[PDB]
Amino acid sequence: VNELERINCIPDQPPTKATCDQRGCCWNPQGAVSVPWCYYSKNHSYHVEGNLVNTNAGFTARLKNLPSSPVFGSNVDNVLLTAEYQTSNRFHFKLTDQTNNRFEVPHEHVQSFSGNAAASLTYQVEISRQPFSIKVTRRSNNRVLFDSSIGPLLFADQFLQLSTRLPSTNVYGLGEHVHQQYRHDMNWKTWPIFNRDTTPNGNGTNLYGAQTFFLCLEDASGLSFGVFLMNSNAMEVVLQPAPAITYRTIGGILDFYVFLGNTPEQVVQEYLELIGRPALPSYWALGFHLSRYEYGTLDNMREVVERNRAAQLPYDVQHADIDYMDERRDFTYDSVDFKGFPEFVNELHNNGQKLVIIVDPAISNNSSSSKPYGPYDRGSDMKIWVNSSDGVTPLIGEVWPGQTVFPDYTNPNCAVWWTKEFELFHNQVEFDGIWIDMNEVSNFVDGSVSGCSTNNLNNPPFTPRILDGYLFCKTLCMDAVQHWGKQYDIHNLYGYSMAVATAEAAKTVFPNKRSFILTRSTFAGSGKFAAHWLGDNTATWDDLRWSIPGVLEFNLFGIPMVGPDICGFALDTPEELCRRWMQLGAFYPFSRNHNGQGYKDQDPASFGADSLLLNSSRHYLNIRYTLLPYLYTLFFRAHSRGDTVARPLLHEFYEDNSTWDVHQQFLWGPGLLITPVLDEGAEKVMAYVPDAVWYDYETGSQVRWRKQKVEMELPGDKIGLHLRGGYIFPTQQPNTTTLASRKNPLGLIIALDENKEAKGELFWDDGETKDTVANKVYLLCEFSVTQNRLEVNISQSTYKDPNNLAFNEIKILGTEEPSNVTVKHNGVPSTSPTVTYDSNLKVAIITDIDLLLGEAYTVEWAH
Numbered sequence: 116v117n118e119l120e121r122i123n124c125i126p127d128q129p130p131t132k133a134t135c136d137q138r139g140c141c142w143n144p145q146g147a148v149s150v151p152w153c154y155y156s157k158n159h160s161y162h163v164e165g166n167l168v169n170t171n172a173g174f175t176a177r178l179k180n181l182p183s184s185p186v187f188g189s190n191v192d193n194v195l196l197t198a199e200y201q202t203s204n205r206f207h208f209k210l211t212d213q214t215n216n217r218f219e220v221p222h223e224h225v226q227s228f229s230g231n232a233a234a235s236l237t238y239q240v241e242i243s244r245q246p247f248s249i250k251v252t253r254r255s256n257n258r259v260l261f262d263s264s265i266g267p268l269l270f271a272d273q274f275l276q277l278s279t280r281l282p283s284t285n286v287y288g289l290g291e292h293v294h295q296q297y298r299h300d301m302n303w304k305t306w307p308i309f310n311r312d313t314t315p316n317g318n319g320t321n322l323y324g325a326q327t328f329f330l331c332l333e334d335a336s337g338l339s340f341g342v343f344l345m346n347s348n349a350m351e352v353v354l355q356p357a358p359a360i361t362y363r364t365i366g367g368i369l370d371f372y373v374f375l376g377n378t379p380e381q382v383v384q385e386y387l388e389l390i391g392r393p394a395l396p397s398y399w400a401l402g403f404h405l406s407r408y409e410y411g412t413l414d415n416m417r418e419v420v421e422r423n424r425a426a427q428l429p430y431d432v433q434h435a436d437i438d439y440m441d442e443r444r445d446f447t448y449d450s451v452d453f454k455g456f457p458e459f460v461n462e463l464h465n466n467g468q469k470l471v472i473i474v475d476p477a478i479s480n481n482s483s484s485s486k487p488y489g490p491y492d493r494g495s496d497m498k499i500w501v502n503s504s505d506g507v508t509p510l511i512g513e514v515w516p517g518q519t520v521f522p523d524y525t526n527p528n529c530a531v532w533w534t535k536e537f538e539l540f541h542n543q544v545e546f547d548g549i550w551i552d553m554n555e556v557s558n559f560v561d562g563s564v565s566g567c568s569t570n571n572l573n574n575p576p577f578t579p580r581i582l583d584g585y586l587f588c589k590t591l592c593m594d595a596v597q598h599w600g601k602q603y604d605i606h607n608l609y610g611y612s613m614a615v616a617t618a619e620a621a622k623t624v625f626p627n628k629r630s631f632i633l634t635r636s637t638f639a640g641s642g643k644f645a646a647h648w649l650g651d652n653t654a655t656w657d658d659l660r661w662s663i664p665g666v667l668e669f670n671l672f673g674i675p676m677v678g679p680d681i682c683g684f685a686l687d688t689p690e691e692l693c694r695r696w697m698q699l700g701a702f703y704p705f706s707r708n709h710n711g712q713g714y715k716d717q718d719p720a721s722f723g724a725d726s727l728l729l730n731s732s733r734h735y736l737n738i739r740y741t742l743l744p745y746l747y748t749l750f751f752r753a754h755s756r757g758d759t760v761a762r763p764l765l766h767e768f769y770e771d772n773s774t775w776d777v778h779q780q781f782l783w784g785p786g787l788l789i790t791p792v793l794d795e796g797a798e799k800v801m802a803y804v805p806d807a808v809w810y811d812y813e814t815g816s817q818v819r820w821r822k823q824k825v826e827m828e829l830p831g832d833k834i835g836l837h838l839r840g841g842y843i844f845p846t847q848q849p850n851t852t853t854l855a856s857r858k859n860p861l862g863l864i865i866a867l868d869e870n871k872e873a874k875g876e877l878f879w880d881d882g883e884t885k886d887t888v889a890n891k892v893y894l895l896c897e898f899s900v901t902q903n904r905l906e907v908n909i910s911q912s913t914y915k916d917p918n919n920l921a922f923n924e925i926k927i928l929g930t931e932e933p934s935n936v937t938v939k940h941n942g943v944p945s946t947s948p949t950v951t952y953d954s955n956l957k958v959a960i961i962t963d964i965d966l967l968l969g970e971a972y973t974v975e976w977a978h
């Protein structure tokens with residue numbers, strides 16, 4: 116064995132020859148740091164027994180265990196391999212215990228496959244007999260994509276493992292973690308996955324969510340593939356420089372999907388086609404959100420709101436954290452400190468703003484006939500709590516209010532309970548959206564108020580390297596019991612089940628509306644239901660840098676509406692950091708400035724009504740709002756086709772290997788390049804300029820750089836923003852709310868390519884109705900520019916905005932002077948627009964034009 120290819124046989128303890136011999140592995144204490152001294156042999160594992168059997172969907176094989184002594188339990192004797200050729204670009208295989216049913220994720224979106232093997236496969240599947248291995252290769256070039264032959268298949272009740280070689284080291288994904296870099300180096304690295312309330316810091320631990328998806332860019336041609344494991348048990352993913360990746364899990368079954376694409380974007384699209392495409396956000400959820408833990412009183416909250424309104428900050432949503440509650444209890448508000456709450460909400464609404472309230476899962480069990488607590492009384496009547504292992508007594512833990520029980524959101528009768536709680540509360544405080552937190556689930560005691568019994572669930576043969584080394588640390592007992600099964604098996608599905616139930620509640624509370632759900636904990640497929648934030652970060656320059664890979668990864672995971680707490684949750688934010696963070700933060704898909712308890716104010720206006728930070732924050736938030744029709748159309752493509760929103764350079768520029776590890780810059784869709792200053796004291800950033808025409812957003816000027824590293828001059832008041840030649844960006848005059856800004860004149864920014872051509876599109880609907888796309892109530896138009904000509908073209912036309920909207924300005928970058936501008940409407944001429952032209956910058960701006968939204972036009976000019 117070449118040392119890069121050794122598969123570690125002692126993941127659980129420091130390596131010894133005696134343990135190696137006892138396990139029947141190979142011993143070689145010679146090797147570079149991290150190279151396993153003890154590793155699985157060439158042979159041993161499982162072998163194929165007899166022949167493969169053709170089925171309608173693909174094939175089955177029986178695998179029989181090559182005997183050895185138990186490591187972490189003894190391998191299941193007979194394993195069944197079921198292989199389904201589901202589509203041309205998606206292969207599914209699962210490994211089950213041939214004799215017993217095992218836990219399988221009861222995913223809400225994924226359906227069982229029936230039907231026949233797809234035609235025109237882009238992949239071929241190869242099975243080796245002795246020992247068992249599975250290989251998936253790309254048909255067109257025979258590139259080996261998945262190849263398990265590097266390691267054994269291990270399949271014991273509480274220890275399952277399968278490895279695969281990888282065709283390159285361009286590997287992106289896995290979660291939820293702070294990876295720090297976007298491209299995984301492929302040096303010996305183990306990532307534990309198990310939903311846990313812990314700080315997203317530099318220690319590389321398991322965080323709030325469970326995401327097994329990874330994408331691999333195979334080569335410069337763009338050809339890419341992805342892998343997904345459908346398994347909700349505690350697990351870790353081991354990366355090594357072969358290159359190779361091992362999945363090591365402690366229950367369930369190995370249920371794998373392999374996705375192929377011509378480009379990275381097509382791999383994400385194939386993945387989201389399987390697990391579920393993201394929900395379309397309400398248009399208002401794309402504006403700026405402001406928040407903090409512990410305003411303390413409504414007076415203090417109103418004070419913050421009003422100083423940011425007075426500053427003309429674009430500011431659509433105010434969040435209210437646990438301080439609104441009466442003693443941190445769900446579905447109450449503090450009648451003294453938040454006296455006047457309903458009247459404040461009216462004020463918010465009348466100002467065009469929205470209210471999002473935090474709701475925790477854990478319910479106070481403190482209720483007597485003297486002093487009733489309704490959510491607990493109604494919950495106990497319905498019998499909808501998570502129970503201890505006896506299957507009958509509700510588990511007691513502790514969160515914000517004191518001792519608590521936990522809803523079992525897997526029980527469909529729990530959504531009924533939860534919905535009524537929301538109905539009852541909305542009658543008091545008319546919130547518009549819901550922020551669901553602490554849903555790993557997070558417990559202030561370990562397991563329960565009486566701890567956890569010693570047994571194989573709470574104390575398993577092998578524990579992945581999760582924070583603190585016990586599964587029940589700061590969560591529920593592993594033998595706690597829910598409708599979908601035991602906590603051991605479904606722990607990673609709590610936040611997922613809770614987002615599903617919460618989306619159910621929205622159907623009653625916000626009939627026909629999307630509303631907004633923000634969730635902490637996630638499983639694969641959570642973006643169908645919710646936005647995500649990156650959790651309790653810290654006001655450091657490290658946390659600023661680390662945010663970008665975290666945002667890009669959740670876009671691969673199909674949770675495109677994602678961002679961190681701008682300026683940092685924990686700690687007092689320095690002015691310089693917060694100013695650089697607000698500049699970048701104006702371009703996160705989810706843009707929220709949120710702050711921890713006790714720390715100095717960090718809302719933009721708090722820095723002073725004439726401060727650089729406020730001026731800069733207002734400036735870039737106004738740019739964000741200007742480009743909201745472009746951002747919104749990007750979320751439309753994510754929702755309907757599965758595209759990313761916040762996009763890596765390498766997804767558009769994969770032919771250039773200089774982009775393969777860029778994580779300090781990113782794109783909005785194909786066309787907008789964002790380059791933040793991310794270092795203290797810097798007024799410059801070393802940045803990559805991909806192989807395209809680029810125009811400075813602010814001046815419109817063509818940059819002299821192409822396909823090269825540059826130092827971009829970015830003073831205290833700037834972030835780099837460039838528009839790609841070849842693309843047309845729809846815009847709308849901004850205002851301090853989207854309620855108002857949506858009524859304003861539209862514009863087009865045409866960035867010309869070398870041939871003086873460009874293309875773009877605009878999606879437009881009512882901005883809030885649920886499933887306008889599935890029910891086809893929307894406008895979609897295309898803009899295309901050739902020499903001397905712009906065409907506005909309508910493809911779907913089943914929504915006409917009642918506000919009489921129109922394009923009143925067109926800015927053309929990289930153009931020679933356009934003259935004699937003519938506008939035709941469905942063929943008919945007329946009259947004559949104004950053109951202003953800057954021959955130095957090659958910018959033309961056409962005004963005094965009125966192109967109605969949803970109407971076809973041709974706009975023509977001479978040179």
Ligand SMILES: *[C@@H]1O[C@H](CO)[C@@H](O[C@@H]2O[C@H](CO)[C@@H](O)[C@H](O)[C@H]2NC(C)=O)[C@H](O)[C@H]1NC(C)=O
Nearest residue numbers: 498500501502506507508509523596597598599
């Ligand atoms: C948790 O325990 C409760 C009892 O405390 C179980 O409630 C049962 O619910 C069904 C209706 O769905 C009733 O017909 C039973 O009579 C209830 N039992 C009792 C003793 O009242 C609940 O099923 C348990 N949940 C889980 C996941 O085990």
Ligand SMILES: *[C@@H]1O[C@H](CO)[C@@H](O[C@H]2O[C@H](CO)[C@@H](O)[C@H](O)[C@H]2NC(C)=O)[C@H](O)[C@H]1NC(C)=O
Nearest residue numbers: 466467848849850851852854855856858859860
């Ligand atoms: C941007 O938003 C505000 C709403 O907050 C609009 O404010 C004014 O609009 C009208 C003036 O033409 C008045 O009828 C409203 O009373 C007034 N609202 C306020 C602040 O009192 C403003 O018009 C919007 N901008 C644009 C271009 O429409």
Ligand SMILES: O=S(=O)([O-])O[C@@H]([C@H](O)[C@H](O)[C@@H](O)CO)[C@H](O)C[S@+]1C[C@@H](O)[C@H](O)[C@H]1CO
Nearest residue numbers: 312313314407408436437473552651711712
């Ligand atoms: O006391 S804290 O440090 O703030 O508790 C955090 C962890 O529980 C804790 O750090 C844990 O990891 C240590 O064991 C918790 O996540 C805060 S929540 C999430 C945030 O967005 C809201 O504003 C907060 C109030 O609702």
Ligand SMILES: *[C@@H]1O[C@H](CO)[C@@H](O)[C@H](O)[C@H]1NC(C)=O
Nearest residue numbers: 314315316317318319320657
């Ligand atoms: C690792 O964890 C501890 C917090 O318990 C902390 O002291 C340290 O900052 C963390 N390491 C890094 C480098 O983030």
